[model samples]
Target chain A: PNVKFYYFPVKALGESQRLLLAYGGQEFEDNRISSENWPEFKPKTPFGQMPVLEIDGKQYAQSTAICRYLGRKYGLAGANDEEAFEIDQNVEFLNDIRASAASVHYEKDEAVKAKKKAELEETKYPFFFEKLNEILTKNNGHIALGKLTWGDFVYAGMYDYLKAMLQKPDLEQKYPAFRKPIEAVLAIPKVKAYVDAAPRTEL
Target chain B: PNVKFYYFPVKALGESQRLLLAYGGQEFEDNRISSENWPEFKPKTPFGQMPVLEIDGKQYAQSTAICRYLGRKYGLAGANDEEAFEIDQNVEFLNDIRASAASVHYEKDEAVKAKKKAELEETKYPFFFEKLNEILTKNNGHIALGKLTWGDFVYAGMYDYLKAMLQKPDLEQKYPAFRKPIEAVLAIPKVKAYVDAAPRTEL
Candidate 1:
């Protein structure tokens, strides 16, 4: 049975899970839907939300939960109780940042978006990213657990997103440790090969 | 092994886990820290966030995760795979609603709060509550394996808050099936006893 990954075409939200599964060498059916088709297709999805992960015939929503499930399946999660709790903490931190970004980006009104973006850029991003940078720097930029894990993969994806969103293309220079994990993941033979071969829609 | 829960005095964020544990009769220590003590106390917490649940000296942050851990521990989650997944979906939905409410409450500007509250009251609350109501109606208001699972308890608590927020406190009267679970959970002898015996807090 095929495991289907259903989402709106944009890599904006669903890319992290896709990358995680792909990096871990798990094959899945990618069902990239467009806006025109979404209205008709959305209802079928559980909770009418996108990025639903369908295993065999059953489906699950919530990207982080899906990622956590995949992590457990792929052995990318922590091996011990303490490590698992620590890994969960890092994942939650990454989720908080990504959520903050999405919260501002999804605002309908231009004024609201601007207001949110300013707040995110001025306070949320800098403060959290600084903390992340410090944490990673302390651990010598090891995958949030001093080794490869879903936490590393998630933060890598988040940093990649932040860099893209930054006005200054070289904005990542301030957070070298944060950039290191993203680069490390991209440099992985499996991830590199997947990125080169994988077909993706606009982010 | 003892589990330690740290959160602000209010039941705002930490109440869900407390309720879940109470419903399940899980023994744990409840620790409250004042705002003045947060700075000194935060660094010791994972992710420097409150509502951290420490099980046997290991800590896990995030209220939803803590609640899920407790739910799993007490067999209050679900018996089968499908039921467990359904419980997760319900938790995720409530988490979104709670996040939105937190966002509105935390907004710095009074004007912003007014706008967001109106939007939440008009659109978000109705949309999510109606969806939940429909699910309850379809399932005979017996969510997750037709038992008094954590999902039921959560809905009961959330409805209590929603009723307080709505212009018509009797808004629940409009949806019988929705109110059914709320009342049922409240009337559960164990849960009711716990509520009656539990210390009152400014949630």
Candidate 2:
């Protein structure tokens, strides 16, 4: 596919595309830039954001957009346009939750960060997790479309990151049913291999 | 298409879908809810978010997801998968800028809000607008693909809101080339008609 993914060493937003590429059994360069080197690389990016995927030398930014492109390329999008819409909706919903967690992570004020983190733990986590569990159950343990789409891969890719961000190691354990979909994704041989071999990052 | 769109009486996120549907010449029931009545309607939503689109009575949330679905349905996506990826990348990039502006808009602390707004005006707006102008010029006045796509509609849809939020009425004027795409979008008869007839809101 002539792909080279550029991002930081962490799994933050890059992991989803990494997992997708691995799941599709496609080989690409994983170019992880260090913080010290990002200043030199930032100006070269399209939107000055990380997790840019360069295909055939043309760079595309936005992590989920890259993941969605790979999803379509690998036939992991869905069976039809309606199913694709379902997958996109789930991905965006999960993204919304991630965005909230990110707000807490990036909050500059210690007091504000602590307050936001508490709110996330107390209200946001349970609310989103319970609803996601229901969706997974209804969709036959898949994140969307009753099948293994990129949406499932996205969720699985961010699972560990979210746990670390929230400082809740048992986050997934709280929703036992959500584990079914996560397991389904990891059980894929290529994905499992990637997870086992991928760097264990704190974030 | 049997579409029902639920949103508040604002152009914030709903305008893009509305613009896309208008451009597609599709009819949809625009259900605008009042803030006082939102509590009654909140729980019924998939993720308790407004701008939910119900197709054939099946609900889907997330504004961009809905826009992308409509883009695919109405041939506004792109010529191929690669083009689609480009369009999605542009939409997401523009969304990143919007997200920053939203932080300023929603900031409860006056001091923080002013600081964020100033940062947006000084750094974010110029950086994004200059790059977007270059893209527009390269793409023959279109936002992406060198042709009319959903990316153009998304940018056009948010143009007014961004200007208002930034308190820069000459936002598009600052980037003369960027105005070409905005004018092009509005020149579409259906979009023009919709814009002319659509409700005027502060946002």
Candidate 3:
């Protein structure tokens, strides 16, 4: 049983799974496909997609599936079936944020990009993040399940990435309790050590 | 246990799941929400989204999760571990296609919508379709693991959707093997009957 992750050398999509495996204390080979070699290596991936995870020579594509698989293996998903369902639900909600943000990222034109970003800021982010903050606040800002779970770590990582991309510097300040869960995740010794030792890229 | 599905009446996001349930010969409530009532109903959803599947008074969001959960319940996923993995992999690939298409769906402006749709048509759709065709052809167009897995039905359903959305009506003709799966799915008696009996809606 060998684990190897293949992705572009950026945090774009692959970074989440890499972080999951790292935080879980799992050993994995991080094989990045640089622009120089992508031409030759890209097609080798199933469905010609990147961020593929290989286990014992068997390949799995798609970032979310890879992340969930690692989360399930690492006990980050939740404590019980119900908790896992809640965690999965939150993860799915966070993805809507990511997807809305990504539309801004991939938008080539300045005016259109601004428009899309503004829409996310005005509508999607507030709508979802506020509800999430309420959940965290109710649970004493521990984890979505009131203890450390995979959703907490992944959500923290995701929020970190998103906050940096936010045009508003005081974005998270609006919801202090929301920041509490993320801080709780970052303060975990294993996660803290992993974050300190790992090399991260901003995509 | 009661099963209820909440989606727009359109064959957009959750229709595939509906079709899957139908193909499995399982009975469930098809509860659709209209745009006029969406604002009122949205908050009731776990994450303020549609296509939530309610089972035994618990709601599950995320289309992929819902589909996989049902697939597992119905034993349509696969009978063996290896086959199940392939089934999961195939469904995962179809998830990517759905994401690509949703980009266009979520676009607000006409210019942006057209541009994104063109990008999907030119790059994402063809690339995914070609690779999928190759895999299907290699598997003798039997879907993965030589079984009528949910992945096969999903892929077939997706191909039908993609072909209908393609700017070029004959685009699928370029890959006969790619088109064969859709044909195979439509030929399923239960599936065919469900599709014919289901009400038409403008997605």
Candidate 4:
């Protein structure tokens, strides 16, 4: 499919789609909309949000939707609906963690940011990380169905983004189960190539 | 399928699944977990979240995933991949609106809460409402596919909750396009029956 990837110049929300497109053996024109161009470009988006994917000139919004759509095409989404639900469950759970981190990252006051960070580190992260690690362990390193699916790509792609947001370089270091699946994804030559060549960003 | 629906005693995040399940012609046990019983129930949940659906005793977390699953079962989801993608996009977009409203609703500080409410009403709500209105208009009453799908059910079910969060009461009055599709969803007898019988909440 002819693809035009549109997002800010970041490897955050848009990275999973890029990796999926690469793994599926499809090429795309990466259109990284920067801050300077945002005002002019914002109006054209389906919703006033970044990380939209345009395939064959048709726009698709929501990064998770785009990732699932691309993943489905290559049978990396799931073997069936049940597996798909598992993927969705894991992805959404991870998203809650991201949202918590973002609440801290975007805070204007340093004191409030520090407090939020404390809450996340002391309360939020442990809760999410433990549950997710349990799931990963149950699936034998995969996020869903004990096999590499779109969930792995989604989690793996967002790992660095999460790290940057938390400013914790070894954020994934503590969770051994979480570490394995992400490693499995990056070990794939196609995904590895894309990650190595991907633009660096602070989320 | 032996179905068990688990959520709180509210129609906030869990309403979409209930409506879809009813429309799909299945009766499930609606287990409304309250604040008092929550601590006991929290660890039993897949992700320590509400609005989980268990089909044939297998639990599935994530409200959107459960809604989509039931919608697919009933042909209320979408006909194909593109339509599914459209549903995913719309659902996620509406979720963002809910998140913003939640941000205001859950704020403890009076000054910050009031400021957030001002920001929402003055800027955020207008941006989301207008774009959603355009989409609803283009679809001629549905949120996607130019026909009633899961997106309509989701948007319709969450309408009251959004209004409560914003404290606008008549929030839908300004957006005619948004109102029509929501009206269409509630017009369905099964969905109407479910909504009318469901417990109300302040949200």
- Docking level of model 1: acceptable
DockQ of each: 0.36, 0.78, 0.41, 0.78
Write one digit per residue (lDDT tens) for candidate 3, span A1-203.
Answer: 68898988777667777777777777788888898999897778886778889989988877766766677777776665567666666666667766666667777889988877877877777776777777677668754667776666666656655665555456667877767766776676776777787777644
Interface RMSD of each: 2.8, 1.1, 2.9, 0.9
lDDT per residue for candidate 4 within B66-166, as digits (tens), equals: 88877777887687899899988888888888888877787767887797788778888888888878888888988888898988888877777887887
Query: In candidate 1, what are the lDDT values of residues B1-203, reduced to their tens digit?
Result: 78788888766657777777667766778788889988898889866788888878877887656665667677776775456667766666666766676667667778877887888878777777777676677667755456667777666655555444443467667776767775667676667787787776534
Chain B, TM-score, each prediction?
Answer: 0.81, 0.91, 0.81, 0.93
lDDT, candidate 2, B29-97, per-residue tens = 988998999999999998877889887889978888888988998898987888899899988887887
Best-matching candidate per TM-score: 4
RMSD of each: 3.5, 2.2, 3.3, 1.7
True contacts kept of each: 0.19, 0.86, 0.35, 0.70
Query: If you score just chain A, what TM-score does every candidate get?
Result: 0.85, 0.91, 0.83, 0.92
TM-score of each: 0.83, 0.93, 0.84, 0.95
- Alpha carbon lDDT at A57, candidate 3: 96
In model 4, which runs have C-alpha deviations exceeding 4 angstroms?
none
* TM-score attained by model 4: 0.95
Better of 1 and 2 by lDDT: 2
